Amino acid sequence: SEYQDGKEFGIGDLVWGKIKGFSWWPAMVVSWKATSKRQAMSGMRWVQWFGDGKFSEVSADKLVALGLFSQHFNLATFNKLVSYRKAMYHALEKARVRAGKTFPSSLEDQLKPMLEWAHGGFKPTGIEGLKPN
Amino acid sequence: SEYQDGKEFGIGDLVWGKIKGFSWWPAMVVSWKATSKRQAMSGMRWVQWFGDGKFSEVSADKLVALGLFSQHFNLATFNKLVSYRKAMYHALEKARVRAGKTFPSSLEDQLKPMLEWAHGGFKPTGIEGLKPN
Ligand SMILES: C[C@H](O)CN(CCO)C[C@H](C)O
Ligand SMILES: C[C@H](O)CN(CCO)C[C@H](C)O
């Protein structure tokens, strides 16, 4: 099947991805069929970046689980780039729905509790709640 | 462990492969389990072509190490087909990472410092740097 190479991460997985020149950026692992390109080379994954919805072929070694959040969240980039704040919103919103989390009720204002939730370890489910299905 | 038939090339090796009708094209030796197809016959190797990510079963005797770069790179085919230029880029990119090489930052644009690095024997690492792991 697809992505059967021993490396980590499968379709639907929420991940951080590192592209040369950019901060770790939130993404979702997708099948190559969604991309309109080609099958990924061995040991790579197609991902779709939150915020801009583009596709990149990325090594599985340049990906980590989104659940390792405080370790890869870049606070400077978050303060500097509106695009990164938009990216976090769509990424954490997808996380929230998967985990079955709800928050009370703007952009910054809506992000704040999702951000605290993520930074605090995705409680109560922990990272387990971020799995696909 | 598959491919233990005494012949050359193991999982992860960067190689040139020839299919009749075609120049030498860069590829990576993969396990049959990545292909979603049959196990490979004796003396054969599954390869995945850079550029289109498709799979082919190729005799281990019709494969050379990517390191023999200038001897098998085909300049006529390169200038003629963009597919080949794409294949070369992805192949050299994987080469670059394995090696730990770096190139200051378009397509043919990004290709120039890579192509020169390869044509001149992949210094400083030499071909020893293209090995898997
Ligand atoms: C605006 C920002 O560049 C978003 N990118 C997506 C590049 O296609 C993600 C980054 C390259 O990892
Ligand atoms: C021409 C094409 O884009 C590259 N092919 C791979 C297709 O099987 C490699 C060649 C057939 O050796």
UniProtKB/Swiss-Prot annotation, chains A, B:
Tissue expr: Ubiquitous; highly expressed in fetal liver, heart, kidney, placenta, and at lower levels in spleen, colon, brain, liver, small intestine, lung, peripheral blood mononuclear cells, and skeletal muscle. Isoform 1 is expressed in all tissues except brain, skeletal muscle and PBMC, 3 is ubiquitous, 4 is expressed in all tissues except brain, skeletal muscle, lung and prostate and 5 is detectable only in testis and at very low level in brain and prostate.
Domain PWWP: 11-69
Places the protein is found: Nucleus
Extent of the signal sequence: none
Record PTM: Sumoylated. Citrullinated by PADI4.
Subunit structure: Interacts with BAZ2A/TIP5, SUV39H1 and CBX4. Interacts with UHRF1. Interacts with DNMT1 and DNMT3A, SETDB1, UBL1, UBE2I9 and ZHX1. Interacts with the PRC2/EED-EZH2 complex.
Function: Required for genome-wide de novo methylation and is essential for the establishment of DNA methylation patterns during development. DNA methylation is coordinated with methylation of histones. May preferentially methylates nucleosomal DNA within the nucleosome core region. May function as transcriptional co-repressor by associating with CBX4 and independently of DNA methylation. Seems to be involved in gene silencing.
Disease: Immunodeficiency-centromeric instability-facial anomalies syndrome 1: A rare disorder characterized by a variable immunodeficiency resulting in recurrent infections, facial anomalies, and branching of chromosomes 1, 9, and 16. Other variable symptoms include growth retardation, failure to thrive, and psychomotor retardation. Laboratory studies show limited hypomethylation of DNA in a small fraction of the genome in some, but not all, patients. Facioscapulohumeral muscular dystrophy 4, digenic: A digenic form of facioscapulohumeral muscular dystrophy, a degenerative muscle disease characterized by slowly progressive weakness of the muscles of the face, upper-arm, and shoulder girdle. With disease progression, other muscles may also become affected. There is significant clinical variability and incomplete penetrance.
Family: Belongs to the class I-like SAM-binding methyltransferase superfamily. C5-methyltransferase family.
Written domain comment of the UniProt record: The PWWP domain is essential for targeting to pericentric heterochromatin.
Protein name, as recorded: DNA (cytosine-5)-methyltransferase 3B
Residues of the full protein shown: 215 to 351 of 853
